[PDB]
Amino acid sequence: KKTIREKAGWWSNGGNEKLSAFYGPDRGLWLGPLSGTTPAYLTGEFPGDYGWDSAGLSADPETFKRYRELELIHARWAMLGALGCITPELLAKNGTPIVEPVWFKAGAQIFAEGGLDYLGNPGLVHAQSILATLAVQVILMGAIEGYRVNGGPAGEGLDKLHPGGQFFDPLGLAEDPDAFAELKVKEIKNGRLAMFSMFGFFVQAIVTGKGPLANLDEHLASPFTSNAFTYAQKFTPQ
């Protein structure tokens, strides 16, 4: 029936069952084969439908599309966070002199003597005041996040989650229909992974107080002694 090079997926022209496992009723689910009754409103026409509405918060379709909006915005913010949490630590272990490269203590860098050196360099950003930084942040973010919901200079009548015009798809990866529908579920799966990992960053910063790459090195050195259970005795109520 099917030869060896088609089973490996050599030919990307005759792939029409690529969206069959992520959209439609014959897709992968949350508990796999141990999830029979898919919720009847999660029909799989949206990216990331693993049939998971166990708390039932998204039965109404208006609430469901608002939760889809919140999920994708939180997904992209946590993706930018989980890239922007480890990369100061990665560049400090590189040798670039970032003076406080852990993400949970990087906000206190602007209360130092020399302000906020960006890559550890006074030739860079060198921001001193937290007040003007938060002021230009709330002005710029008010303009951008207000342009987001009802359009603006980078698109007006486009989709509220996937505009993809000349500004938000400048490389043009989503010109094809099937490629856009596949990279939608790729985006939301990477975003759910990064949301889970940012929750892990929050809990790891709370109960350990060290760097996430420091946590990775202290798990690589001793996996069985330095697990999450050696810090399980840190919130015992006395």
Added chain:
Amino acid sequence: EFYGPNRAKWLGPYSENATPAYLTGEFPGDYGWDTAGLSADPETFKRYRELELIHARWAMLGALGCITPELLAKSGTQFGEAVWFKAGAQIFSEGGLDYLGNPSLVHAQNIVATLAVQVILMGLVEGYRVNGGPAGEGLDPLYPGESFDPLGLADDPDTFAELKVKEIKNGRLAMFSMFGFFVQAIVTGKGPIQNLDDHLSNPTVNNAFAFATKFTPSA
């Protein structure tokens, strides 16, 4: 009572208009308390009923699994660590996790292997809850029967509904008790039957108001 439009309600005599119109008395413990309207949609009502009964049975199992080492500490077996918010530290001890203080009965050493075996059994038995399996197949996901009732107390449907409302009332009381255990573990630091021993030692000082000050910031 306990079913129909003339059943026991959450305000009692003052509960003829505050009860929502969509909380009609067919489901167990329908006391008419949806003051935030979260179970207005029927799918939200069904999913919240599933969450309520599963949280109920997990809470009563947790209540007995928390207080029975305390009652056995009253009885006389010492335990690795009777205190339920210090009970996980038995596997971190030198002798390991002895079950009833018996070193030749469990003697658990690896917490990582305990979590691995625990997740390997619990993921399977939690995924079997959704779509049948070796126990059942396609029953009511909240009241399966026919494999988990070896005595089978679900014969008469009136007594079945009576046992349903008894279960969900014991379950609301159990989640109430487990929430109490949670928020009186963190403010006292003593076991719950030990807090009962404090409150029975002197009832007017060993209250929650003896520890009502400790959570002020104070710079």
Added chain:
Amino acid sequence: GIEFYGPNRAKWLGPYSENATPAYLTGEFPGDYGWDTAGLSADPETFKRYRELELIHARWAMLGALGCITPELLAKSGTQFGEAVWFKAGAQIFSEGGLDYLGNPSLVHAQNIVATLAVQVILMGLVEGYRVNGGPAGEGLDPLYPGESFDPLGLADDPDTFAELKVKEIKNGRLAMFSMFGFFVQAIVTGKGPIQNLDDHLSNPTVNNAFAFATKFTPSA
């Protein structure tokens, strides 16, 4: 050439076998040399169960012969194992330092034979109940040659050579079954590995054959 199916095929006595073959061995099955001189498979359902037994014995004996030859060849090439000889490779779980897989301590490092046997019982009961009934790797399939999860390389297509591959599988399986019986009896009467017995027979074949061990299991003592 020589074929292995039909009314005339490769038979068990060779050229002196046209009267020797039974009536029920018409030759539609792989490995039908017509050797049923004791008549064990005259009933066709007994014959079907015996074909399943022969093929599963054949595959397990092929795996077993490769696993009896493999660590001894790796020991004679480069690798210090725990105990590369196959009939003493079980007790490495009692070597007080673990069962190193390729001799390296970074490997599986097993020390508890009861847990090893227990997870083997669980996994083997699961996989053999899948083999006789069905499961995640195919539900409705042939009980001996399932395919489409045990042929990812597609060698069962073009079924005229899939019949030849069935005959090749049963022939290497019968050779491996014969070789596993030889491994067992050689382990019993020589006490050394099959490759150690091969090096012995290659050194001096006149006295490192079997007849030097003919007086070993004597009935006097």
Added chain:
Amino acid sequence: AIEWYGPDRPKFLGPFSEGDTPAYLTGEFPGDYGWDTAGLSADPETFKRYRELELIHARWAMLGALGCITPELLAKNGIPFGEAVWFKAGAQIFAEGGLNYLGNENLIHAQSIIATLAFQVVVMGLAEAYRANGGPLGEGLDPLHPGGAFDPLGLADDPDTFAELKVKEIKNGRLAMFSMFGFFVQAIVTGKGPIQNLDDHLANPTAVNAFAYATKFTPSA
């Protein structure tokens, strides 16, 4: 699940037993679990003789599994009679005073194995040949379950619980044959009594199990 007959019945692979249970095993006999993976009993005459042989093996194994445990079970109470194990129990015939039944000297206390052997040969040939053919208690009846004087207590009536007790008898008998094979190999490998093996396992299970005796039959040569 409350049936041991019919098409749907308890089976030897549990939920893995739909692809098993061939057409000639229909559940019409006591103890049918669909275990004929070897395919030895396709012919119902062969199946009938195998069922008779299995059930008389079941009766003799239930006799044996209790007759091997009771000498060590009365040695638990402290009654000393020569030796308590079953596999070295015959040599008490050749003792200084002969094999005693309960140790008290006014009991059976026979000395010659050949005379009681001849008595056993004659009365057991007569009894077993009456079992096969027929004698003074029923001539032509069931070769499996005669009844009559074999049921003086009236359990052969009401045939549904007769079938239920047939399944109970074959299940306890199969457990007894499994236990007796285990008795034989615990005598062979360990060399001590089975109740002594139970005491050694209850005293120390983790190091004293069968895997402790796994290196005994290793051929040194």
